[PDB]
């Protein structure tokens, strides 16, 4: 009848450990689980809890502790990888009583950047004149991307690509603006290493 | 077996409007339910059904009827659409125990159709710099102008849909009122993009009007798409 999740999203690096906390307010006795949710796919459950042992596996050590004592059912992971970022969803049913969820929390795990060279550069659309934007990549996980400020202009928030190498993940955002001459090195201003298209034949 | 489908899985309508979003479960489960996800509130029940034939009012009912045909078979009918409507639901069978979903159904119910607009997208091509200093090219594409945020972007790298490499926005972002943008990386080797006999593609598909839905405007009618910006690998030097 009632679960609540206090936290809507928790950021944790790769390595660290993660605790997700979940409160239900059930008359009766209450069966409880974990779903999560991958970007944009159904919920797939995790793990869950019926009877006898309070503390419930899942796969990869997720481990779900329940406490009538004091009502919760906190999920916990001993050491999250970048994979394990998704939405995560705390649910309470009984007999006779259809799936309650909580509102999610969105664990966004930052991976370790062992070499990470900062640059901005400016791309081009080569089927259109003017049209241009700024790629900024190859951060460190913990640098915060600047924010938009004025109309007209944009910045995306990070997101991070995986190649098929042993290191290949990036960090990747992306900037534009309708403005007649603004470049990459003012509305990325917050950061390092901006490497201008100036082009060279050899 | 395995499965929960939805369908459609995108749809667009006019307030007003009747909308039937349909589940087909092939698990002989006896339960059947209508969720849908917003911000703010997770999943939330609005119908649910014990039994072929039977429908059980969830926790926000009202706007929406059920109807269970068969065991298989669960319905949900907004009679008279309203843009609160607008949502992303999800159908999930059940044997008493753990649910297994759907993959969602996007609705946008709207007050004026003419909103609905496809995107254009843009092909920006790898920095020189980036190429010279990592031996790597990002390419960037970039979708824009788009209402109905229903869309999937791909890459196709000669004719073969790619997924090593690329990383794209999980969440369209909206840079006016009836507007939406979404942007993708696709990272590869200097090597590769060097190649002229490589082909890149950006693909967009639109999910917006049927063929049937009336367009209440002299503008070509902005029905479901498939939209690409695409280039070739250039040599160097
Ligand atoms: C740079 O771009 C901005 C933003 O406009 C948007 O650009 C993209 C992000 C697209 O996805 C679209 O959503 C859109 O084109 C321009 O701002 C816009 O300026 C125009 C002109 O002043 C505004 O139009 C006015 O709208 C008011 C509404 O009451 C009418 O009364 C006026 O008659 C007039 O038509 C438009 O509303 C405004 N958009 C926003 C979101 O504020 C900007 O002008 C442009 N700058 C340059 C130098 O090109
Ligand atoms: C249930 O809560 C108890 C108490 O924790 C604190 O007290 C609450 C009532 C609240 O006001 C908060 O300040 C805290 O949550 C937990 O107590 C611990 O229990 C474990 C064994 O379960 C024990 O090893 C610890 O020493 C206890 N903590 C202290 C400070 O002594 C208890 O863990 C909770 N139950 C479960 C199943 O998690
Ligand atoms: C848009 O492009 C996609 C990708 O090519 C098309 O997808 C095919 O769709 C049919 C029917 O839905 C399937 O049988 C194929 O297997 C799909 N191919 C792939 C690679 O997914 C889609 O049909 C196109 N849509 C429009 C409206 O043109
Ligand atoms: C890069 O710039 C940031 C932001 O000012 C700064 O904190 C940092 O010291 C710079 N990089 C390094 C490696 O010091």
């Known amino acids: 009848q009632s679960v609540t999740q206090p936290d809507a999203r928790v950021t944790v690096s790769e390595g660290a450990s993660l605790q997700l906390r979940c409160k239900y307010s059930?008359?009766?006795?209450?069966?409880l689980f974990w779903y999560v949710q991958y970007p944009r796919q159904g919920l797939q459950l995790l793990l869950k809890?019926?009877?006898?042992?309070?503390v419930v596996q899942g796969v990869n050590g997720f481990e779900a502790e329940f406490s009538k004592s004091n009502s919760s059912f906190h999920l916990r992971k001993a050491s999250v990888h970048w994979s394990d970022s998704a939405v995560y969803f705390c649910?309470?049913?009984?007999?006779?009583?259809?799936?309650?969820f909580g509102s999610g929390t969105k664990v966004i795990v930052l991976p370790y950047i062992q070499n990470p060279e900062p640059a901005v550069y400016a791309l081009k659309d080569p089927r259109s004149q003017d049209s241009t934007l700024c790629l900024f990549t190859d951060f460190d996980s913990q640098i915060n991307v600047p924010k938009t400020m004025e109309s007209g202009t944009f910045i995306t928030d990070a997101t991070v690509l995986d190649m098929k190498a042993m290191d290949s993940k990036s960090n990747g955002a992306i900037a534009w603006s309708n403005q007649t001459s603004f470049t990459c090195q003012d509305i990325f201003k917050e950061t390092n290493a901006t490497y201008p298209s100036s082009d060279v034949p050899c | 077996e395995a499965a929960v489908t939805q369908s459609p899985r995108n749809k667009v309508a006019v307030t007003g409007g009747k909308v039937t979003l349909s589940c087909n479960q092939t698990?002989?489960?006896?339960?059947m339910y209508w969720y849908r996800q917003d911000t703010g509130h997770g999943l939330r029940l609005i119908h649910y059904?014990?039994?072929?034939?039977?429908?059980e009012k969830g926790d926000i009912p009202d706007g929406y009827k059920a109807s269970r045909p068969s065991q298989e078979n669960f319905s949900l009918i907004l009679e008279l659409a309203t843009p609160s409507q607008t949502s992303v639901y999800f159908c999930?069978?059940?044997?008493?125990?753990?649910?297994?979903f759907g993959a969602g159904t996007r609705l946008s119910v709207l007050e004026d159709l003419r909103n609905v607009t496809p995107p254009k997208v843009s092909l920006f091509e790898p920095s020189k710099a980036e190429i010279a200093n990592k031996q790597k090219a990002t390419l960037v594409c970039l979708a824009r102008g788009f209402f109905p945020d229903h869309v999937e972007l791909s890459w196709w790298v000669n004719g073969k849909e790619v997924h090593s490499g690329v990383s794209t926005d999980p969440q369209a972002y909206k840079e006016s009122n009836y507007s939406y943008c979404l942007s993708s990386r696709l990272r590869v080797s200097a090597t590769f993009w060097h190649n002229p006999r490589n082909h890149f593609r950006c693909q967009v598909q639109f999910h917006g009007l049927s063929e049937e839905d009336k367009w209440p405007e002299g503008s070509p009618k902005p029905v479901t798409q498939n939209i690409s910006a695409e280039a070739w690998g250039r040599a160097d030097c």
């Open positions: 698990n002989n489960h006896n339960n």
């Open positions: 809890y019926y009877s006898g042992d309070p």
């Open positions: 059930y008359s009766a006795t209450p069966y």
């Open positions: 999930a069978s059940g044997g008493g125990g753990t649910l297994y």
């Open positions: 059904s014990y039994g072929a034939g039977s429908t």
């Open positions: 649910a309470v049913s009984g007999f006779a009583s259809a799936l309650t």
